[model samples]
Target: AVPFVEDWDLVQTLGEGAYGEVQLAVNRVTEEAVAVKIVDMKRAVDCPENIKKEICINKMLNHENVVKFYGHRREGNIQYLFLEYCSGGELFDRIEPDIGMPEPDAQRFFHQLMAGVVYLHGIGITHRDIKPENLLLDERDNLKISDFGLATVFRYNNRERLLNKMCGTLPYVAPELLKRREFHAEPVDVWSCGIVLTAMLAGELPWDQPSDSCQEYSDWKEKKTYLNPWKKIDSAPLALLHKILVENPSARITIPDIKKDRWYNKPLKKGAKRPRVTS
Candidate 1:
C-alpha cells in the first residue's frame, strides 16, 4: 500500500525516453492531473546518477515560464517524478516547416522563452538542451520550458565554472560546444536561443550542424548571401540574431545585450496576451 501509488492513478503514457516513460496521472481524490515520469532502475543504465541532478535542479526552479516540478517518490527501484501537466502539448507541433507562424506569434513565444532562460540563468542553472520539442504549452497556450535532464549549475559560492559537456541537439548546439573545450555557460545557451528564434521565423534550422564539417555552416561562417533563414529574417531581429550566433563565445551577445535589442523590446500586438481559461 504505497501512498504514491494509492493517491494517484497512472493513466496513459505520454512520452518515452531512453530509461523511462512519462505517464499521465490524476489524483484519486481531487482529480487533479499531472505527468509522472517513471524510471525503472533495474533496466536503466547511467540514468540513475544523472536523474538526481535533474530532479534537484527542476525542484529548485520556480518561474511561470518553466515547467513546475511537484515532487518525487520511489517504489522499490522505480522512481516517480510528478510534474505539471501541459494540456496543449509540445510547442513543436505549432511550428510549420519552411514557413513559420506569423511575426506577432513568434515574438510572443520568443519573449516568454527568453524570460524563462533569464530566470534559469539568474539562479545559476544552465539548460544545456533547449529546442521547440522541449518547450511545452499549457491550456492557456503559455510557453513553459521543460526537460531539465541536461541542466546543471554553472555557478556556486561566488565562483563560476566552465562547462565542457557536449549535450544538445546538433542544429541548436553552440559552435563552442563542438570544440569539446571548456567554455562559458551563458553564451552557449544564447546561441541555442538564436537558433530557436530562427526556427520560429524561418521554419527551418539555418544549418544541419554548427560545425566546420557542415557545408551550410561553412557558408554561414563565410557570410554567404541569400541564406534561407538569414535572408528571410527582417532586419530588426536579424541584428539580434547576428549578435547571438557568433562563433566566438566571447564575442556573442549576452542576455543583457538581448534585452537591449530594439526588435526584442517591441511591444506585443494589443490583445496578444491570452487570459487563463477558468472553465
Candidate 2:
C-alpha cells in the first residue's frame, strides 16, 4: 500500500500463496481497507503468467458478486494488486458440518453465485476453480467470488472452445476437468456451481468419506458409484439436483438451462414477479 500511494499502511497478514502473500491494509486518507496481493517479479518472470492473467481478467470484471480489483503498482521485481477485502471469511468457513448454511441464505448466495458465473461466462473468462473457499463474504454476509489464479481466457476467436489442461481444487473439480482432456469452460463452471449448492444444503460433504481402497474417488470418476450426496438435499426432487450434478459433463445442466429450471424458476417467495423472457 505504501508503494502504491504512500498512505495505505499494512495492518496485518491476510493470507499467503505459493509465490506471494496477501496483506490487509488501509488508506489513511480514505480510511478504506483493502487486501493487497504481492507477487514476486523474479518468480513470475518465467511463468507467473497466470498471476498477470488473473490481474488482467479481474480488472475487466465488474460484478457485484465478484471481488473488485482496486489498483496495482509494479515496484522493482514485485507486482502489487489492491483488491476488495471481505471481513466475514469464506462461504464454507461459516458453515457447520452438521447444520450447514440456512436454505434461504444459501439460496440468496446461490443466485448471486449464478449471477457472477453468468457474467464471467458471457465475457469468455473461465474461473477454472470454483469452491466454497474461493467465495468470500462482506460484513453484510453477501458473497464475493475471489481467487482467479486458475482463471484463463476461454473464448478464442470469439468462439468458446475446449481447453487442454488439468486444473482446479479436487473436490470442486468437474468430471471433464478430471478426465483431463479438451473440456468446455461453461459446463465446468456449471458443474462446480452444483457442488457449491450441494455443500450448502448438506451440512456434511457428499464426498470426503473415509475409504480404504481409495476407490470412492475412482468410483465416482467411473460414474457408477451411487453414494448419496443428496441425503440432506430434500428440498426439491432428487432428479432436479441430479440434473446439475450429473457425472457426465455433457449431460450436466448449463447456466442458461439452470435459469429455466422449474425449481430454480419458482419465485423465492409468494407474490414476486418472475423474470420476463421474450421470444
Candidate 3:
C-alpha cells in the first residue's frame, strides 16, 4: 500500500516544478530516507491519462539503472509518490563552466546511461524526456533514470506516426521531433542521447548556432550531415558525436553500439574512475 505524507516526517524540499514539489521525507517505521513527489490532486485528476501512463510505465519498469517507485498515495486533495532517494542530485548540478567532469568520467556516465536506456528499450519503454536535469545520481555516483512523467510505451510492428502534444526541452529534442515529422521512439531517444553525450564531452551544446526562426533551426539541424560543430575538439569525441547526431534515425547508433566504441575502453584519472554500482 502507498504511504501517506502524514505517515512520514518531511525533512526538506528537494525540488519543485509546474506540477508540484518533491521533498526529502523519512519513513516513520523504517527511518529510511525517501523522496516524495507531491502532485496536486486536482491536476492529477484533470490529467488522468498522463498520470495513469506515468504510473503504468514506472510500475512495469524494474532495472538497476532506473529509479524505483515505492507507491502512490492520496491525502485529501494531494497525491504523493514515494521513490528511491538520489542524494547526489541532478547531473545538471554537477556540470558547469569552472567545474566540469573529465572525458573518461563523462564516458562512464554515458555508458551507464546507455545501459539504462537499452534496458528501457528491451522492455519497450521510451523516455520522451531525456536530459541532464532528468538524470539523477545516488550517493555513490550511480546514475538512475528518473522523471518518467513523459514516458510512453510503443507498440511493436506498428509504424503509425504520432506527434507529441508537447516537445521536450529545446536543447535535447531530436530534429525529427522538432520538425513534427513522424519518428520512432528509439531513434528519437538515441538522438537526444547524442546531444547529451556531446554536452558531457564539450561542456556545451553542439548546435549552439542560433537561428531567427524555428524553420531555420529545423533546416540547420536537418543539414547537419557531417561532424557536429560542438564536437570540434578531438577525433575520438567527434566520431562518437557523429554516430549519435546523425540526421537519419535509421542510421543513428544505439546504446549497444556506443558500448562497443573504443573510447569507452580507455582508463581515466583518479577522480575520473568508472562509477561503481551500489544499492
Candidate 4:
C-alpha cells in the first residue's frame, strides 16, 4: 500500500544526473526521513514506454537489498518517487582512487548483492542496471540496489529467450548483452559483479585501459585477463576473483556457487559474522 503523503521539507540535493534530481527530505507530520527522486514528467512522457516499464518493475520488487518505494506523487509535470533514505551514500563513493574497504568488507557487500540478484531472478525480475552508483548503503552499511529506471521482468516459463534491449552502463555490460545473443540474466549479473569485485579488490577498475568501441570492450571482456598492481597485498583471494571474472558466461560463478566457495568456508575472525543471504 502507498504510505501516507504529507508535505516534506527538502533538506538538500542528494545527487543529480541527466535523468533528474534526488533530494533529501523529511516528512513534516511523521518526522521520518526519505529520499525523493524528482523527474520532469515532460521529459519522461516523451519516453512513456520506459517510464511504465520502470514503474511496473519497481512495484513488483520487494527485497531488503532492493530500495523500498513508499509511494509516488505528481506536481505539475514533475513526478516524485518517495523512497527509503540510505545514509551511507553511493557504493561508488567508497571505491577506486578514494580509499577502498578491506577484503572482508568487500566480500560481505558482494555476498549481499548476490543474494539480492539471486532473489530478483527467482522472482523473475532483471535489474538491467547494476553499476556502483545504483548500489546505495544505509547507516548500518547494508547495501540497497536502487535505480530500477531500466529494469524489466521476464517469465521463466516463457520460450521468448533473451532480451535484445541494449540498456545499462557501458563498462559494466555483459558480452552476451552486447552481442544480442539469447542469454541468461544471471550470468550477465555475474559478469558485472566480477568487475565490481575486481574494483573492490584493487581499489581501481582493471579495465581502466582504454576501449573506445563496444567491440574493443567485448574483446577485453572475452579475454578476462587484467593485471592488478596490488596483487602482492592480497594473493589468497585472487582465485575467487578468477572464478567470478571468467570470460565465458557459462563458466561464470553463480550466487549459489559462490556461497560454497572455499574462501567463505574459512573461520570467521573475532566479532565477525559470516555473510547471510536474507530473503
Tell me, by lDDT, which candidate is best. 1
All candidates' TM-scores? 0.92, 0.84, 0.83, 0.84
Q: Please, what are the lDDT tens digits per residue for candidate 1 over residues 1-279?
A: 545545888888888978689999998877899999888877757767878878999888899999999999978888899999999898888889998777778888888999999999999999988999999999988999998888999988868999977788999999888886899998988898899999888888988898889998898888873778778888888878878888999988898888889998887556645668775
TM-score (C-alpha) between model 2 and the true structure: 0.84
Give stretches of model 2 more than 4 Å off: 1-6, 44-48, 208-228, 235-237, 266-279
Clash counts for all predictions: 0, 0, 0, 0
* Residue 261 miss distance in model 4 (angstroms): 1.2
Quantify how close model 1 is to the true structure by its C-alpha RMSD in Å. Answer: 3.5
Per-residue alpha-carbon lDDT of candidate 3 for residues 1-279, written as tens digits (9 for 90 to 100) = 656534689899999888789999996877789999888757645655666677778888888788999889867777788889999999877666532467767777887888899999887788988888888999988889999888887655554335454567767877666555477788878877777776776666655322325444454456543443443445676677668776666788877787787675556534635769999
Clashing pairs in 1: none
RMSD of each: 3.5, 6.4, 5.2, 5.6
Task: Give lDDT: candidate 2, residue 75.
Answer: 82
lDDT at position 271, candidate 4: 47
Model 4 TM: 0.84
Ranking by lDDT: 1, 2, 3, 4
- What shift in Å separates residue 18 of candidate 2 from its native position after superposition? 1.5
Residue-level lDDT tens digits of model 4 in 134-245: 8999997889999888777654575434666777776677766655457776777777776677666666665532243534444444553443423422555666766775
Order of candidate numbers by TM-score, starting with the best? 1, 2, 4, 3
Stretches off by above 4 angstroms in model 3 are: 1-6, 156-166, 208-232, 269-279
lDDT of model number 2: 0.77
Instruction: Provide the overall lDDT of each model, using Cα atoms, as 2-decimal numbers.
Output: 0.87, 0.77, 0.74, 0.73
